[PDB]
Amino acid sequence: KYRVRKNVLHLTDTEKRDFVRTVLILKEKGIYDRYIAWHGAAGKFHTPPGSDRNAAHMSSAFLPWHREYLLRFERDLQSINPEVTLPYWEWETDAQMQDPSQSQIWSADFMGGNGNPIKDFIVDTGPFAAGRWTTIDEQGNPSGGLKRNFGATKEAPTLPTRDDVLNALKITQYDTPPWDMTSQNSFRNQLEGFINGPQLHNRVHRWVGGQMGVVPTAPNDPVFFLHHANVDRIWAVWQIIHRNQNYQPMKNGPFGQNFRDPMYPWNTTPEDVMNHRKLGYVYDIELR
Numbered sequence: 001k002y003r004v005r006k007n008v009l010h011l012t013d014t015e016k017r018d019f020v021r022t023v024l025i026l027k028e029k030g031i032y033d034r035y036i037a038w039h040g041a042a043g044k045f046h047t048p049p050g051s052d053r054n055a056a057h058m059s060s061a062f063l064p065w066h067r068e069y070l071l072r073f074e075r076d077l078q079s080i081n082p083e084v085t086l087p088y089w090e091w092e093t094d095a096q097m098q099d100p101s102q103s104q105i106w107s108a109d110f111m112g113g114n115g116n117p118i119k120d121f122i123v124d125t126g127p128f129a130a131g132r133w134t135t136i137d138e139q140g141n142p143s144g145g146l147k148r149n150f151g152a153t154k155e156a157p158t159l160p161t162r163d164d165v166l167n168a169l170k171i172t173q174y175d176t177p178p179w180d181m182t183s184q185n186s187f188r189n190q191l192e193g194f195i196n197g198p199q200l201h202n203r204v205h206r207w208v209g210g211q212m213g214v215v216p217t218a219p220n221d222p223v224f225f226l227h228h229a230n231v232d233r234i235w236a237v238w239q240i241i242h243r244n245q246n247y248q249p250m251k252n253g254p255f256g257q258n259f260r261d262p263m264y265p266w267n268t269t270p271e272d273v274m275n276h277r278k279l280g281y282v283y284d285i286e287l288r
Ligand SMILES: Cc1ccccc1C(=O)N1CCN(Cc2ccc(F)cc2)CC1
Pocket: 057, 193, 194, 197, 198, 199, 201, 202, 203, 205, 206, 212, 213, 214, 215, 216, 218
């Protein structure tokens, strides 16, 4: 309950400056790239081989994997500046806007704006604009700049709504067999966004576009972490409401998906990260 993770819209000018100031540093040192690679590596690690489940997505481990993923990044952030925590992008309230792209998160002093259609949707405003921020492709090679294209697809023309989030929180089971994209009455799958997809988490990625629109290159966009922080916040809320509901599967799931299994590419288990408070952080909405 030490580190407080704040709503992006609640950040001060200084807090925003410091966060962005801290991220380019991780990037400059070569630490940021470690996170891009981890995500891509886990995405291609199938549980079991030949299945469409992987270590980080389309399965039960989706939530704890990104929580650990998000946990590690923050610590790296703190190592540069102990006053800096990972904020979250409350995309459900942005969806209430007629044009979500006018949200403050996309201001030139924080995340920067939408892609330039003249430059094939390269981002040329903000701290992470092309020439300020180098990107890497699926194969781990330099790719030439961040891209974004808000609501440019028919499958996801809009961001998920507060109701979408509220309905997900109603689900009683954390997850259900066969522990994958096809799971029904499943909070993880629902939140992931595979129920009548794309919805929620998956919808956000699709909405943003650019690197965020594909699994192996999504972390190239710093907003990926703000996004998943919100996803993690939602999960945390679900945990506080359904206090006696626990992670599933406990056993007999694919290896890497069970409660006591190491979540590739780490040795961290879902168990090790079930309680968001034991990891040393809390969301601001828990204190209000
Ligand atoms: C194929 C499909 C089926 C259902 C819902 C969405 C989609 C889809 O096209 N996505 C493309 C964009 N990301 C991919 C993605 C997922 C998780 C990440 F950490 C990073 C990137 C979200 C899902």
